[PDB]
Fold:
Amino acid sequence: GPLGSVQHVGFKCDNCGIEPIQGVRWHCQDCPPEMSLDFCDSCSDCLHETDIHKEDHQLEPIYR
Amino acid sequence: ARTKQTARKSTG
Ligand SMILES: [Zn+2]
Ligand SMILES: [Zn+2]
Structure:
């Protein structure tokens, strides 16, 4: 599945709440299984902070 | 955020 068609059916954007990230998945690299954040390509410009998600943590594009 | 459960294949 190429770009514009990568649809992570079961992995929701924490920032806008789309339940499976379509286009490309932006995975939260440092966040743990409990707080297993993900963003959509509309949303990965975000750099929020929680108890565990941080400005020091990393985002990763997924093209499959 | 994960929304799909892991492939546990037990206690459905
Ligand atoms: Zn989003
Ligand atoms: Zn994160």
About this structure: DSSP finds no helices and no strands in chain B. The pocket of zinc ion (ligand 2) is lined by residues A 28, 31, 37, 53, 57 (CB under 6 Å). Chain B touches chain A at residues 1-4 (CB under 8 Å). The two ends of chain B are 22 Å apart (CA to CA).
